[PDB]
Design a protein around this ligand. Sequence first.
Ligand SMILES: *C(=O)[C@@H]([C@@H]1NC(C(=O)O)=C(S[C@@H]2CN[C@H](C(=O)N(C)C)C2)[C@@H]1C)[C@@H](C)O
Ligand SMILES: *C(=O)[C@@H]([C@@H]1NC(C(=O)O)=C(S[C@@H]2CN[C@H](C(=O)N(C)C)C2)[C@@H]1C)[C@@H](C)O
Ligand SMILES: [Cl-]
Ligand SMILES: [Cl-]
Ligand SMILES: [Cl-]
Ligand SMILES: [Cl-]
Ligand SMILES: [Zn+2]
Lengths: 242, 242
Amino acid sequence: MWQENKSWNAHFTEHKSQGVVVLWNENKQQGFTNNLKRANQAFLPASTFAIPNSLIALDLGVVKDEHQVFKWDGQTRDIATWNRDHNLITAMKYSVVPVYQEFARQIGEARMSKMLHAFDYGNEDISGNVDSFWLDGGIRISATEQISFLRKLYHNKLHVSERSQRIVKQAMLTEANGDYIIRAKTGYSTRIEPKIGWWVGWVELDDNVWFFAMNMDMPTSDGLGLRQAITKEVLKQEKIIP
Amino acid sequence: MWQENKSWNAHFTEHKSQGVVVLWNENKQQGFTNNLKRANQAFLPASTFAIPNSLIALDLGVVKDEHQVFKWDGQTRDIATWNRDHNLITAMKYSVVPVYQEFARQIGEARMSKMLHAFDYGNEDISGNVDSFWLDGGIRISATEQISFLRKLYHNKLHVSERSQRIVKQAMLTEANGDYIIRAKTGYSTRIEPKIGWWVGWVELDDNVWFFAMNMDMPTSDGLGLRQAITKEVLKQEKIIP
Ligand SMILES: *C(=O)[C@@H]([C@@H]1NC(C(=O)O)=C(S[C@@H]2CN[C@H](C(=O)N(C)C)C2)[C@@H]1C)[C@@H](C)O
Ligand SMILES: *C(=O)[C@@H]([C@@H]1NC(C(=O)O)=C(S[C@@H]2CN[C@H](C(=O)N(C)C)C2)[C@@H]1C)[C@@H](C)O
Ligand SMILES: [Cl-]
Ligand SMILES: [Cl-]
Ligand SMILES: [Cl-]
Ligand SMILES: [Cl-]
Ligand SMILES: [Zn+2]
């Protein structure tokens, strides 16, 4: 069911990094990770919460479709890509928290809490601000729990409309070529130690789907690109992508 | 509305090719092409008919979803990738005609004809075999008419279910990265002269969509890569993609 491949640790060490990568082979129903312990340690989701947030906002009508413009509120913020108008697609690409904070406010505590339990998402705890608990509140999720959640979304098995799940998987589109499609979401948790980076999603092949969930210590922002780089090095090592 | 930029002809001549590239800027409602007349010249759609064929097959229940497997019929054909099982996604990726011919037969002449008129697709003429009319029958469509049809598909404004249009646009996914998304379908018409290549689809940017339809004379198969190459060289020249 679960095998620990410690050879993947070389990909972390070669970049002076530490963390965990979790892969799940959907065809054979087998999981693989370099660190079974960290694979099951729960962290703040941070921007990876964009996925369940978007599904709920769509299903409840808070967002009509992927085209609806979310106008800038005027306030100029630290990340330049947030200082512009956005829709559901671009909000996910640039992890525009103000947009998702508005999503959560209109959803409300009671509906957020019920939906996350319906999703079986993480520790299902929204303690803190209804609109920042995924950044500095009580919600925690592990890499293996991210896989379980992503597998339901892939199969349209989440307790929301099929349309909601199709739209969010469209927004998750990150890379595509003749060899594979990657649908994924990055995360960068800074408000509580340990500071970590996330990359969760899956790789679509012609005849299989490989889900992945990785997190790594991120004491500084210069190594953010290692989230994708280390994951792809493991994918390349396992001959899942060329 | 329309503007002719004859400088793009260099991209055809430098490859000893002739053809047309038609671009449509969705935000500005403006069109650009190297050849206004050939932009309106109608040809057999060939494999680009996979788009309306898939929409109809989905809307009528011929195809249940993008996962339904269509078993290889055992008949060994010249294109190896056709000699395997396929779903709606890999059927479009590998242009598997036998799959689409099975689609057409189950749709029927009467429903095929009614839907192409509802789609306002080309000259709406299905004369010939119900399972080969887009290959060697009477249907004809121009590059500008392809854009007209694709614009309706993008906006979910075709006379089919929204789910049907979302699934087909997922199957059209051809390339994606941090700069753009290309949803498109290639074509290669070899049954009736003149032999031509097609590439129709659109480029998704953060804040705009650039629809494109190109076709070119294809006397020899070694030029098939020029369908994408010439299109991307024009896209680069217009600073649409890096
Ligand atoms: C979500 O976790 C946070 C935001 N998400 C990300 C991320 O997933 O990378 C960032 S960092 C952002 C991405 N690249 C930008 C950059 O370095 N430059 C443009 C120079 C910054 C956000 C912090 C959310 C909690 O804020
Ligand atoms: C459709 O027009 C025909 C098929 N479509 C294509 C095509 O769009 O390329 C081919 S060629 C085949 C599939 N893609 C491969 C390719 O482009 N190269 C590797 C060069 C090989 C078919 C002929 C249909 C009517 O047969
Ligand atoms: Cl933040
Ligand atoms: Cl699992
Ligand atoms: Cl998609
Ligand atoms: Cl053929
Ligand atoms: Zn060239």
